[PDB]
Amino acid sequence: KIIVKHVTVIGGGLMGAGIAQVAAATGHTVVLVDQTEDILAKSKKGIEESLRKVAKKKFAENPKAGDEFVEKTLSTIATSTDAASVVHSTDLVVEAIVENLKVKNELFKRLDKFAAEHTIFASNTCSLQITSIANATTRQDRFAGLHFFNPVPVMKLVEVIKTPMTSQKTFESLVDFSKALGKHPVSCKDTPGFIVNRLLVPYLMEAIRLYERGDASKEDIDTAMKLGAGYPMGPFELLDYVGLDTTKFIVDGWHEMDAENPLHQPSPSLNKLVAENKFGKKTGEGFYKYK
Amino acid sequence: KIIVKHVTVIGGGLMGAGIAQVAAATGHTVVLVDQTEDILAKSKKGIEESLRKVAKKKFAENPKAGDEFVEKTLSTIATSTDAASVVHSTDLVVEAIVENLKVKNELFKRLDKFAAEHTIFASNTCSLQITSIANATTRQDRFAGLHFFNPVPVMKLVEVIKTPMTSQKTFESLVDFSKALGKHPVSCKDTPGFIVNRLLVPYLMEAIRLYERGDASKEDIDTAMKLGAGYPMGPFELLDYVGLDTTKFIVDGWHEMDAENPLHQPSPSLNKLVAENKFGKKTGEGFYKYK
Ligand SMILES: CC(=O)CC(=O)SCCNC(=O)CCNC(=O)[C@H](O)C(C)(C)COP(=O)(O)OP(=O)(O)OC[C@H]1O[C@@H](n2cnc3c(N)ncnc32)[C@H](O)[C@@H]1OP(=O)(O)O
Ligand SMILES: CC(=O)CC(=O)SCCNC(=O)CCNC(=O)[C@H](O)C(C)(C)COP(=O)(O)OP(=O)(O)OC[C@H]1O[C@@H](n2cnc3c(N)ncnc32)[C@H](O)[C@@H]1OP(=O)(O)O
Ligand SMILES: NC(=O)c1ccc[n+]([C@@H]2O[C@H](COP(=O)([O-])OP(=O)(O)OC[C@H]3O[C@@H](n4cnc5c(N)ncnc54)[C@H](O)[C@@H]3O)[C@@H](O)[C@H]2O)c1
Ligand SMILES: NC(=O)c1ccc[n+]([C@@H]2O[C@H](COP(=O)([O-])OP(=O)(O)OC[C@H]3O[C@@H](n4cnc5c(N)ncnc54)[C@H](O)[C@@H]3O)[C@@H](O)[C@H]2O)c1
Numbered sequence: 029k030i031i032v033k034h035v036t037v038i039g040g041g042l043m044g045a046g047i048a049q050v051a052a053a054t055g056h057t058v059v060l061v062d063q064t065e066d067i068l069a070k071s072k073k074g075i076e077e078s079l080r081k082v083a084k085k086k087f088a089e090n091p092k093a094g095d096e097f098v099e100k101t102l103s104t105i106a107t108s109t110d111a112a113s114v115v116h117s118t119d120l121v122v123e124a125i126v127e128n129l130k131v132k133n134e135l136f137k138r139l140d141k142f143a144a145e146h147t148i149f150a151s152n153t154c155s156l157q158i159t160s161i162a163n164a165t166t167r168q169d170r171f172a173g174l175h176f177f178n179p180v181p182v183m184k185l186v187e188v189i190k191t192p193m194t195s196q197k198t199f200e201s202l203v204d205f206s207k208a209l210g211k212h213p214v215s216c217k218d219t220p221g222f223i224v225n226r227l228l229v230p231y232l233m234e235a236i237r238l239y240e241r242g243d244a245s246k247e248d249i250d251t252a253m254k255l256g257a258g259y260p261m262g263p264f265e266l267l268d269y270v271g272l273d274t275t276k277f278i279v280d281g282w283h284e285m286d287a288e289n290p291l292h293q294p295s296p297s298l299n300k301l302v303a304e305n306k307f308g309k310k311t312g313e314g315f316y317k318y319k
Numbered sequence: 320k321i322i323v324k325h326v327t328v329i330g331g332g333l334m335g336a337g338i339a340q341v342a343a344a345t346g347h348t349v350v351l352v353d354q355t356e357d358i359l360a361k362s363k364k365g366i367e368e369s370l371r372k373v374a375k376k377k378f379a380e381n382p383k384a385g386d387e388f389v390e391k392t393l394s395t396i397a398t399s400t401d402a403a404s405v406v407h408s409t410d411l412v413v414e415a416i417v418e419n420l421k422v423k424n425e426l427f428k429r430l431d432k433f434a435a436e437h438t439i440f441a442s443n444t445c446s447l448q449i450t451s452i453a454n455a456t457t458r459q460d461r462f463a464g465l466h467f468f469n470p471v472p473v474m475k476l477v478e479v480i481k482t483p484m485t486s487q488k489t490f491e492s493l494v495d496f497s498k499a500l501g502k503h504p505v506s507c508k509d510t511p512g513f514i515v516n517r518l519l520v521p522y523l524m525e526a527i528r529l530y531e532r533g534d535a536s537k538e539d540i541d542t543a544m545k546l547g548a549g550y551p552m553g554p555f556e557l558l559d560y561v562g563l564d565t566t567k568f569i570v571d572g573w574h575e576m577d578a579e580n581p582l583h584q585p586s587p588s589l590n591k592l593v594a595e596n597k598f599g600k601k602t603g604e605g606f607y608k609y610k
Contacts, residue, residue, distance in 0.1 A: 185543060223543040227529065255503055260549040
């Protein structure tokens with residue numbers, strides 16, 4: 029049973045950056061990997077802002093301690109554009125790239141050849157099947173899902189997904205790691221969307237359909253869900269927060285799998301926004317515009 | 320335009336009691352109505368208890384102010400077992416009885432005969448069509464939906480639903496009343512479930528279906544939604560909190576309306592609990608067991 033200490037995070041986007049931030053803030057040595065040096069600089073810069081906020085609040089009285097905290101956490105995050113070399117010796121690979129089965133499979137099939145034998149592979153996928161991605165490698169006993177929640181520095185949940193091939197030792201290492209991160213792991217079966225997404229995503233699509241039906245405005249729906257059901261964000265605010273591209277990819281995947289299911293019927297409005305590269309907060313504009 | 324001062328709340332259950340409490344607390348003369356003196360007594364006791372908890376927080380540093388608030392509010396709430404004896408001199412009727420169309424129509428048809436000419440009729444229905452209930456009377460211009468959220472003393476949202484026949488005068492009186500109650504009114508179309516329910520209830524059913532599938536436990540599903548989506552309550556805690564009998568009625572109505580729609584397929588587990596008279600917190604046991 030390995031103890032996760034050196035963590036390789038593939039993808040420095042919304043989730044990848046957050047995962048790297050929390051892992052580094054909790055004493056793990058992290059290596060954040062992405063496609064270009066510019067994307068990585070943007071990711072690390074973003075992680076700094078997220079930590080800076082904490083510092084200015086959590087260390088109001090002790091400013092120097094705050095800076096030290098921010099600097100030390102950032103220093104614990106290395107960057108690279110060559111995953112293959114980085115995984116040679118790493119305890120865990122947490123993949124957080126585009127929600128696309130083929131792309132993830134190709135990624136893991138390749139890394140499986142460069143990673144040390146003890147290395148554990150984990151996918152932060154929202155809707156794909158872990159068993160499917162695991163079989164893209166010959167390391168199934170060391171493969172499982174480790175699903176975090178947006179934004180990683182705040183959301184306490186982490187869904188741990190075993191495939192029937194995942195070993196108890198691998199499972200345990202991931203559970204321990206989740207806790208070391210200060211998170212609350214919940215073991216889930218390898219079913220589409222696991223728990224949260226399986227219930228959240230269809231709800232967000234119903235929200236869009238209500239709007240498309242012409243029954244209410246996005247503003248009123250968001251206001252209603254927040255003031256009537258006590259939700260932190262209305263569905264449209266949340267969609268933009270999460271990313272319209274990721275949501276669309278998720279629903280398209282389920283749609284292909286069960287085309288006759290009306291619950292996975294894609295949305296024209298959603299498709300139009302994604303087609304115009306308006307992914308929400310990521311790009312500065314989604315259902316709503318952001319400065 | 321009439322300014323609502325006297326309100327007759329019919330039904331002293333979860334919502335009725337809450338509506339009567341807030342109205343009285345905000346300076347309206349209230350008459351709470353229910354089937355028996357005993358039921359009314361229990362309702363009044365619950366309201367008093369609710370008021371004291373409010374006093375503890377709102378008047379923590381002034382016990383006397385707290386006592387006066389509790390006393391004044393309770394003395395503003397009169398009771399009667401027959402609303403017909405009250406409506407001839409009331410400004411607004413807010414109905415909050417069992418979620419059943421036939422029963423609601425029977426009630427309004429009768430009150431229509433006793434109510435004063437200017438009296439506005441409002442239904443707090445969750446899933447029925449306001450137009451249908453309105454046509455049970457010949458006062459459609461003074462009929463509309465006024466939908467509050469559980470618990471009324473806390474939830475700020477209030478969906479105001481006018482029908483094609485609702486007069487502007489009636490609508491504005493209800494918007495003004497909502498604000499007088501310190502609420503945030505949102506005008507909604509007369510469509511099934513209006514805004515919130517149309518989106519929330521199908522989600523709650525999916526939570527149940529996921530559980531019945533054996534994919535996960537109610538406890539983990541609740542934990543996941545609270546920690547992953549930041550919801551105040553897990554779906555099962557909310558279900559018991561809202562009332563399983565009410566939820567079942569809501570869905571049965573929509574199901575009869577569109578039998579093939581996967582959104583409204585009845586739950587065997589939900590039907591069984593209701594059949595065994597386990598409606599949730601209000602009965603001491605629903606999906607979970609309470610004191
Ligand atoms: C998409 C999928 O398939 C999978 C999934 O992940 S589903 C999406 C799951 N996530 C959600 O549902 C998001 C729902 N929204 C929320 O829970 C909340 O709105 C939120 C966590 C985003 C925070 O919103 P908020 O309450 O308004 O806080 P905000 O006003 O934004 O910031 C203030 C607080 O939040 C924290 N915060 C917010 N974002 C932060 C970040 N990225 N890093 C560090 N702290 C942050 C601050 O530390 C601050 O703490 P204090 O209250 O002590 O001062
Ligand atoms: C079916 C339909 O058609 C329409 C509907 O109603 S759908 C369902 C809508 N309602 C929801 O979804 C409920 C979601 N849940 C919630 O928002 C919250 O859990 C809640 C409002 C029920 C309160 O939960 P909570 O935060 O844990 O409060 P609780 O711990 O229960 O009590 C403490 C606080 O809540 C308040 N409170 C809770 N119940 C109360 C009541 N019945 N009366 C007065 N105050 C109450 C207190 O004022 C108190 O204030 P402080 O924070 O300052 O101490
Ligand atoms: N957005 C959310 O709220 C949320 C929450 C949990 C899980 N997820 C899941 O996590 C994954 C990450 O989504 P995200 O929001 O961070 O998206 P994102 O688009 O913000 O970030 C993805 C990052 O992956 C990089 N990338 C793509 N292919 C790569 C490759 N081969 N090697 C290295 N980097 C590569 C991109 O350059 C980008 O920076 C998806 O599978 C999604 O379903 C998203
Ligand atoms: N439970 C919720 O969270 C929620 C929220 C908003 C609206 N509603 C809606 O409000 C209504 C009230 O539901 P509730 O939760 O208060 O239920 P409840 O079962 O807690 O209370 C209903 C009350 O109605 C009384 N009643 C029944 N038939 C009556 C009649 N013919 N005449 C007079 N009184 C009668 C009962 O004696 C009971 O006290 C329903 O239409 C429901 O859909 C419920």
